[PDB]
Amino acid sequence: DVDAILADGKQAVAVKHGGGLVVVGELGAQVLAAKDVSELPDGV
Amino acid sequence: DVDAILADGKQAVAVKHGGGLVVVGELGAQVLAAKDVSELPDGV
Amino acid sequence: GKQIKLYHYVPLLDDRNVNDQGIDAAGATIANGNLYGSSKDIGTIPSKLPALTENGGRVNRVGFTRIQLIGSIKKFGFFYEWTQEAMDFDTDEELDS
Amino acid sequence: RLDYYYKKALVDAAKEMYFGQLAEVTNMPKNMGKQIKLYHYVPLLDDRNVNDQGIDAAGATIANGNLYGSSKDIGTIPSKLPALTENGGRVNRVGFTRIQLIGSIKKFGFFYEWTQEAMDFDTDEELDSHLIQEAVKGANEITEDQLQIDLLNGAGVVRYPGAATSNADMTGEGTATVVTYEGLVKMGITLNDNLCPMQTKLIAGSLMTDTRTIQGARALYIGSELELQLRKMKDPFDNAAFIPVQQYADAGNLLKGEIGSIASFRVIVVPKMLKWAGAGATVTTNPGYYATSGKYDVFPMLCVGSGSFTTIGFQTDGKTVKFTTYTKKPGIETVSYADPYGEMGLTSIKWYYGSLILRPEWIALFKTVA
């Protein structure tokens, strides 16, 4: 359920050109917001 | 072409500000959906 | 071309309504597009109800399918033949009728 | 060209409604929360009455403020009778209790999308009409199960054939736990104590040749599969028990979709009757019973009264539900940063459903047959 996603803390966006919802995680957002190999979180 | 994205079993998310289109992958989304080091695939 | 093609539209909630346009209440893409199926079993159908929330969004997507029906037409015939000598010399004079 | 395209399409009919008509609505205010509460009162003598005020007539507290309760036993009532001596110092000290009933309202909805290409270059030019007809009909269908699922789940009167007590107990392996004529009459007897009133009056009898007279009964909703078992059902006198509908059609009025009557029940067949599929016992050597999905399939027999289904409508104007549709036709209406061309459409149906099941004395008896 979508509320479980929000209650967990993860956000969500809308996939327009085919698909449903992808859910943004905290690490993923940091992973997603990386320019070079020295801007992504430590784990990855 | 955008149809080639869906044919690859791939969904795509629009960008409001300056991207236009960002292609979203199921491994990427599963990577992107992650709180901490626990929820990323074995490949990472 | 000796073929008649028809279009039968199945109900939404029938198991014949197999379509890829399926999104669940979690926003993910599901396989079964005909939500809740035709299964009249209350052990599963409470789970697959279209439960929305206050948030709303791209959840509980459904599709629709249609079926073709094709007919056919064939030729059939027969005949008989008689000789002149049969009719004139026959005992009955109404054989032709 | 190789074939002729016939225009008229084959469209499946909509399953006739059978449960939504029997419910009554209770309006729920907007500005306040999403729950409705009730205070059901119980009789003093009923065993449901539990209370701390229980001082014995000739003595101290005994933690029983219901006198003899509902014992109905001649060996008990005289002892617990409120006997009083000449000196009226203290007595039974009866108490009273009220029951809190809670009802919830949930949200459900649909949506589907179509591209302009699909509507334009399609073999059939009536695609839009077929989609909306199929969509709204399904919303009508889904609403029905919402009601029926709750009614089946909530029923105080749940009789089990034979010596069974749970769904898992039922099997067709040995002596198949099936509906007996003895079982059906007891459900009526249990229903005869109170709640469910007599849906219909008794049939006096009309001047005919074959017509029979039936007693006042209450509608019992049954799936199509179990109908045969009710048909070939021997009475105690080895005669028929399933009185056919035709044998009292002339005399009394008829309820929709009627098949017949047994004792104090008129049989109603519903095409869309949910069942406990594959919830019985493992089918090792299933003796040709249609009830087989991994395990034995359990079928219900429902008899709804007239005070056991309070459907709460949030803003529904005297209806079990309203459907709220939203059509965004492809074109300018759907032009945005996402699609600056407008080659997408959208239709969504939203609704609000909830039930209460007040006075839960509905009858739901199981059966594994066919």
Add this chain to the structure above:
Amino acid sequence: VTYEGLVKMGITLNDNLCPMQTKLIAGSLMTDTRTIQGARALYIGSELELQLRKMKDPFDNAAFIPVQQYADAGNLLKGEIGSIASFRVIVVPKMLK
């Protein structure tokens, strides 16, 4: 053919078919008539007429209803010989086998 076997067609076929062509015949003021339910014309070869005639209901009574037992009550179909359960029996000279 068996009585439950015949009605097993009816219940399944009731779950889909076209309605009961004929209505439900009510009771008549006569002295020998019976009452038959709504039926759908069943077509049968004359060889099986005897089998239906000496047909036993589950309660060891007569199952076939001779058509004259509801002749005055309702309307008779062409070639009708009688009715069984939810089927009015129609005999056809040219039925196959």
